[PDB]
Enzyme design. Structure first.
Site, PDB file in Angstrom:
ATOM      1  CB  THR A 191      -0.975   0.009   1.183  1.00  0.00           C
ATOM      2  OG1 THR A 191      -0.246  -0.562   2.273  1.00  0.00           O
ATOM      3  CG2 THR A 191      -2.237  -0.768   0.907  1.00  0.00           C
TER       4      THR A 191
ATOM      5  CB  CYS B 216      -3.676   1.252   8.925  1.00  0.00           C
ATOM      6  SG  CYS B 216      -2.032   0.784   8.320  1.00  0.00           S
TER       7      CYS B 216
ATOM      8  CG  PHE C 271      -4.329   5.010   7.087  1.00  0.00           C
ATOM      9  CD1 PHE C 271      -3.273   4.212   6.693  1.00  0.00           C
ATOM     10  CD2 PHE C 271      -4.277   6.363   6.825  1.00  0.00           C
ATOM     11  CE1 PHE C 271      -2.164   4.761   6.058  1.00  0.00           C
ATOM     12  CE2 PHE C 271      -3.183   6.914   6.209  1.00  0.00           C
ATOM     13  CZ  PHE C 271      -2.141   6.118   5.796  1.00  0.00           C
TER      14      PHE C 271
END
Ligand code: HEM
Ligand code: HEM
Lengths: 453, 453
Positions: A266, A398, A391
């Site tokens: 990512t 995340c 996120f």
């Protein structure tokens, strides 16, 4: 209210719509046609795609919905097991590992990773400094070299040495082949059909490769007689305050796999999109370069200098607005509930948040949602709750967000300090989809400013 | 390592440093000058002020350190006796009362208090709804009326009826005047001087009104013949599982005074600071108000809805980070020991945790430590152990923590549901200190959203 639904294919319902190289981009197009929510049915399963901030701010209520494992993530679990990404919230190993590894992303920890991020960043800058006249840069390929190496070294004191390689490290080849096998599995009517015996032989080989590297990383740490406080240190030694227990051996293995996969892809996407938008917007590049040169006044960046690259940070956020590289996350209803006062849901019902579409909600972002304008993030706190979600959400957001943004800010800052960039092919954006999004075939020319490193 | 010490005043040593209306703020300024630890000397005493998470996390080890009564708390014990706040851990009455009253703070108990908290909350909302066009709200005044009434009613089924008064209830006038006399006594060179005999008579007079109200609360309950499952019910009838004993009469009186005091002042501070920061941070106010509008969908909030106000909870914790309303707690060394590898301590040595400084440790929180950012608390597990201690530590931590936050979350939620707020005077924060902290002179305008109650 009854839910919009895209076109159907008989007994296959909506499933053939994802028989495509670019499923997320396909769903985005559906969302453009049908609005903030639509039903998606496949044989024996149903989900609801959300695209508006209005609905998503309800989905992001953790009292009403919890993280779901999409079919894709369920197949990821075949090698990532009960690692943090592919565990259910209610699994003991989720909260345990969450508690154990969160200190690996503390402010002290982030300071401790800075030197090794610089190590990898210097290697990128040196590669580009050493190119001959008229050579170009394969941008996603180089950004993937940087990010894989960064997580390897910062996390595990393991050197992938990707800049010494023409071809991706074996681990990544296996990883990408396993994810590719998974993508193809999503759209197959007979999983058990003997025809697919060769694939699952290859799938088992790819898992073998990933585990071979795991074994090495562990054996090196045990044998270096080291407590180099990094992510691995915490995995091997940290105890969960709630349970008082450490991770067991099997889970540690899954965490290594998880962080080695999730810790780079990512981010490389983000850097590749951010460079794309910069070369397509020279006024923004110039302003970003102005900051890099004004702030990065030493031969290598300090941690504090990186925190001061405010506009570089805004550039990275505005790239995540348009192309969040992990583009969807999945939820389920904890109890019977009504969504948006219009759509009743039963316990167990699944939602999918379509992050690219959320990030184009004109009621939040205004008319010009397609425009690259980092100034939207001048004051990040002006953005309403649940409006910017690259996120994910809540306790299952995340864990590596600040890591990702520090790495990306460091690297982009150095890139803008050291080179001028030219979009010499007039590249037409082509977005490859894996489980993640990346520009494909993005190339640039970088002319050195000849500033010593 | 040699320990820093602030400037001295001859024979008086450091003591005149606390001869101000704002001693904790003065101590914070010293902490900023001198760092993580300094020695503070008076005639006949020494303490060390701690400000770093590194050192405080050791101070919070219960095997090494036990709760101490500061000179202030020792003076409070003149009327709160061996109540829970003013008892030593080794006194029989501490663990007895803690065991007897801890169940009065069970979520089961919280569920039962909720109805009466809403009673007071509704009185506050109605007051503000009934103000005329350009009128303002005296925030700390109203928050204190609310918190006093809540602990009276939920705790003791006693109504202070503070919203029917211009002037604080006599109980609070005397409690405040008594604590002020304590504050002044902490500075007097010859306490027994005849110049302070007027003060000592009044201090006894203030004790007598407190005890008068106690006597009535007990009288009222007995003649009622009720067992209204409240905090008074447990005091009067509860037996300690360990000893098998109830509290004796004397200790019951001390508990009543203790709870009626500490049950309100710190909470009213918290609400006042929270409202302060919200009006100073309109983007946070809008996020909090949006949450309240989305969650509090019924005319009166339910217990379950208050538990759903996650962002409001974050706002309260961020106000406790900057301005913990009980800003210090004291410990002593149980044995000879060495603090932080560098600072030797003898058995009996005293430490003072300076909680506002702890909460500004840049090593933990980052550089932007003075900004109001609720999102620091989005993921509880991300806050290191011993880094956030507004409610004290260990077995001597606040027993009323859940009660305080339920009340505050309920009330701030309703306030944000029902009104828009304006900082019409552009207020400059002025923090009044007693033993606790609170804004002084904080005023706002509340414009009704005209939502029925
Ligand atoms: C720009 C970079 C990145 C983006 C856009 C991103 C995005 C996300 C998203 C959307 C999720 C939620 C997935 C879900 O709800 O199913 C997530 C979870 C996670 N990410 Fe990231 N990520 C990034 C970088 C990283 C990095 C650098 C690491 C590690 C160093 C990492 C480790 C993880 C982990 C372990 C989880 C699972 C957290 C949990 O559920 O407890 N990510 N990420
Ligand atoms: C925001 C609100 C509050 C804050 C910041 C707060 C803070 C504190 C702190 C820091 C201590 C430890 C004192 C020390 O170590 O010397 C404490 C103890 C205590 N608090 Fe609270 N408090 C609050 C609300 C309440 C409420 C609402 C009640 C009662 C209903 C309460 C009752 C007590 C009691 C009884 C103790 C002593 C517990 C024991 O030692 O056994 N407090 N508080």
């Amino acid at each position: 209210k009854e839910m919009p639904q895209p076109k159907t294919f008989g007994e296959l319902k909506n499933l053939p719509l994802l028989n495509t190289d670019k499923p997320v981009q396909a769903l985005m197009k559906i969302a453009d046609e049908l609005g903030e929510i639509f039903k998606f049915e496949a044989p024996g399963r149903v989900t609801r795609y959300l695209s508006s901030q209005r609905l998503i701010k309800e989905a992001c209520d953790e009292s009403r919905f919890d993280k779901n494992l999409s079919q894709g993530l369920k197949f990821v679990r075949d090698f990532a097991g009960d690692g943090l990404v592919t565990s259910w919230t209610h699994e003991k190993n989720w909260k345990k590992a969450h508690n154990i590894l969160l200190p690996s992303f503390s402010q002290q920890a982030m300071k401790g990773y800075h030197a090794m991020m610089v190590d990898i960043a210097v290697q990128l800058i040196q590669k580009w400094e050493r190119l001959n006249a008229d050579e170009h840069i394969e941008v996603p390929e180089d950004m993937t070299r940087l990010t894989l190496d960064t997580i390897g070294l910062c996390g595990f004191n393991y050197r992938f040495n990707s800049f010494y390689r023409d071809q991706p490290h074996p681990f990544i080849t296996s990883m990408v082949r396993a994810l590719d096998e998974i993508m193809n599995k999503l759209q197959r009517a007979n999983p058990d059909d003997p025809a697919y015996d060769e694939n699952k032989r290859q799938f088992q080989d790819d898992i073998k490769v990933m585990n071979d590297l795991v074994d090495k990383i562990i054996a090196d740490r045990k044998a270096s007689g080291e407590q180099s406080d990094d992510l691995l240190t915490h995995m091997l030694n940290g105890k969960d305050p709630e349970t008082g227990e450490p991770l067991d051996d099997e889970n540690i293995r899954y965490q290594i796999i998880t962080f080695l996969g999730g810790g780079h892809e990512t981010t490389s996407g983000l850097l590749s999109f951010a460079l794309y938008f910069l070369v397509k917007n020279p006024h923004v590049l110039q302003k970003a370069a102005e900051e890099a040169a004004r702030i990065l006044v030493d031969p290598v960046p300090s941690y504090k200098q990186v925190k001061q690259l405010k506009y570089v940070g805004m550039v990275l956020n505005e790239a995540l607005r348009l192309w969040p590289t992990g583009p969807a996350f999945s939820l389920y209803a904890k109890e019977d509930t009504v969504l948006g006062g219009e759509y009743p849901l039963e316990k167990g019902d699944e939602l999918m948040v379509l992050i690219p579409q959320l990030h184009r909600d004109k009621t939040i972002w205004g008319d010009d949602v397609e425009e690259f304008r980092p100034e939207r993030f001048e004051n990040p706190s002006a953005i309403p709750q649940h409006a910017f979600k690259p996120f994910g959400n809540g306790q299952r957001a995340c864990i590596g967000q600040q890591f990702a943004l520090h790495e990306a800010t460091l690297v982009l800052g150095m890139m803008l300090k050291h080179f001028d960039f030219e979009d010499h092919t007039n590249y037409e954006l082509d977005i490859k989809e894996t489980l993640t999004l990346k520009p494909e075939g993005f190339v640039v020319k970088a002319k050195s400013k000849q500033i010593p490193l």
